[PDB]
Write a protein that binds this ligand. Structure first.
Ligand SMILES: *CCC(=O)N1CCN(c2ncnc3cc(-c4ccccc4F)c(Cl)cc23)CC1
Ligand SMILES: Nc1nc2c(ncn2[C@@H]2O[C@H](COP(=O)(O)OP(=O)(O)O)[C@@H](O)[C@H]2O)c(=O)[nH]1
Ligand SMILES: [Ca+2]
Ligand SMILES: [Ca+2]
Length: 168
């Protein structure tokens, strides 16, 4: 039925590929090529409605390109991923949201804030601080672990729900 282009963004090392490969292939990768950018496709039923998801896992370099902008424009929703043990990656969220706003030429873009690595005890970003950030953005916040699979489906499916809400 409906096709959704989902884009997974966030700093290096936060778990973007690990989340995406869990969702698609149902295993946890311990180290995956940090530069590679690929898309993945999956059909899922969400709220009784079949959804064909096309998921772009971002990586590459810390640089502007017209080519990356082109692909980011195709996205209909974005996962803003940080790691709960990496404060810099949380500080970086703001940058990704701003660059999304730029390429979509919209401040109302479907997004979900994802705090990954929830299985690690050594947390440095409090749930409250991330919840307050998500509240300021008007988006959901979901804690995940690509390692245990806690919240992985929920994060992607909540982003599809956000895209559906926005399209109406
Ligand atoms: C370790 C490799 C990795 O995961 N990344 C490389 C650095 N990336 C990155 N660095 C800075 N800026 C961005 C900006 C974007 C972006 C551009 C336009 C719209 C939306 C958007 F997120 C991206 Cl895709 C990656 C950047 C990515 C992480
Ligand atoms: N403990 C833990 N490690 C994770 C989790 N997600 C990713 N990692 C690890 O963190 C590192 C970076 O993951 P990766 O998916 O390559 O990050 P990316 O640069 O954002 O794509 C790898 O060692 C992964 O195994 C998680 O939820 N829990
Ligand atoms: Ca990656
Ligand atoms: Ca909103």
């Amino acid at each position: 039925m409906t096709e959704y282009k989902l884009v997974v963004v966030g700093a290096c090392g936060v778990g973007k590929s690990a989340l995406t490969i869990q969702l698609i292939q149902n295993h946890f990768v311990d180290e995956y090529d940090p530069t590679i950018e690929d898309s993945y496709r999956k059909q899922v039923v969400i709220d009784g409605e079949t959804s064909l998801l096309d998921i772009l896992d971002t990586a590459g370099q810390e640089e502007y390109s017209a080519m990356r902008d082109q692909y980011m424009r195709t996205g209909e929703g974005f996962l803003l991923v940080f790691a709960i043990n990496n404060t810099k990656s949380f500080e970086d969220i703001h940058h990704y949201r701003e660059q999304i706003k730029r390429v979509k030429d919209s401040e109302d873009v479907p997004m979900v804030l994802v705090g990954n690595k929830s299985d690690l005890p050594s947390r440095t970003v409090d749930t409250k601080q991330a919840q307050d950030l998500a509240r300021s953005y008007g988006i959901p916040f979901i804690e995940t672990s690509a390692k245990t699979r806690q919240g992985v489906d929920d994060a992607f499916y909540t982003l599809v729900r956000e895209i559906r809400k926005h399209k109406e």
